[model samples]
Target: NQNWRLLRDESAQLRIADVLQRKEQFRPLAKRSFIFPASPQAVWLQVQLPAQKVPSWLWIFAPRVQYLDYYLVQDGQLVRDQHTGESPLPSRSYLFSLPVDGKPMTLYVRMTSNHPLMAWFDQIDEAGLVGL
Candidate 1:
């Protein structure tokens, strides 16, 4: 639920591994507002998954259709690579999950969109449906 840092890729050439190497280039989302300068490009988001309680699944809600790529990194290795969104599919909502290790994990999300992006992250509990 905390703020996430953002990095703009004007050329849209950076991948999940590329961003990890040049982490210093990213800036903090201090103001908590982002305004895209125009033109289709890619952006990287650095998010923190709590170490205390890991969610069963993560939900991504976007304002519009977008190309989403999610990466879960632990110990300098890529554990997950999820691709879901517009153009390639018909789903607007994305569901991603991480290993339940009870340790903090770094999440790198690469997004490619033509329109200005706006999104929200939520956690869902699958245990509640046990009787259902």
Candidate 2:
């Protein structure tokens, strides 16, 4: 209940609105690999953010990703919608703001690509740095 979850949208038509209230049958991200299955279905990730003292951000790093959709929901309602990919992202990663709104929220990501997807996700503070 404290880790990431995954649910493949077989129909590839599911949006944040469709699952804003309902708890989809999402399974744990128990994967031991950086590669996902070879399918056309849209890969969905359910992220949970606990209350934070300082502002945070979700760092999405994916090199092979072509289409990435980011949705931020608070209390089962859409708060923000974002789109990022190799062509539109700065560098090879994407960043989404996670505000300190005195409450928790959900971050949903949908990715579609032909090649096997490889990405890393991290939750960092407002002034966190990368590239060691």
Candidate 3:
């Protein structure tokens, strides 16, 4: 059972603090990739990595999108913050080195786009990502 988390922020105004307070509001992530219609709605994705021996990375292959904000929470504190889509970085792909120790960690992503958007997330090594 590799269930993930998902929550839709219709107002597009809820901050990380607000979302964290309402864990019950989040639902099991149904699909890895989604095609969203044109709108201002923001989507929140929460992923919890399993404690493993080998180090792994989080690869996000979202070619067309507008806003993608990433937050890494460890021990209930924000450890990393990253973003893609129309901000910087040359390519459209994104990769974040994840923690392999310390009993794993969690990732939070807030994504939004002006038009139809396509995005997906995965946790694996570089070789696995290349194979995909």
Q: lDDT (CA) for every model shown?
A: 0.69, 0.74, 0.77
lDDT of 2: 0.74
Tens digits of per-residue lDDT, candidate 3, 31-123, equal 676667878888888887756566677777776567899998876888888866764456888878887675767788888888776678887
Better of 1 and 2 by TM-score: 2
Candidate 1, TM-score vs. the true structure?
0.74
> Could you tell me the TM-score of candidate 2?
0.81
Candidate 1, after superposition: displacement of residue 70 in Å?
0.7
Between which residue pairs do clashes occur in model 2?
Answer: none
Q: Which candidate is the best by lDDT?
A: 3
Q: Choose the strongest candidate by TM-score.
A: 3
- How far residue 17's Cα lies from its native spot in candidate 3, in Å, is 1.1
Which is the winner by TM-score between candidate 2 and candidate 3? 3
The lDDT, on a scale of 0 to 1, for candidate 3 is 0.77
Superposed by TM-score, candidate 3 places the C-alpha of residue 124 at a distance from the truth, in angstroms, of 1.1
What TM-score do all the candidates reach, one by one? 0.74, 0.81, 0.85
What is the Å distance of residue 8 in model 3 from its true position? 0.7
Instruction: Report RMSD (Å) for each prediction in the order shown.
Output: 4.8, 3.5, 2.7
Residue pairs with colliding backbones in model 1 are: none
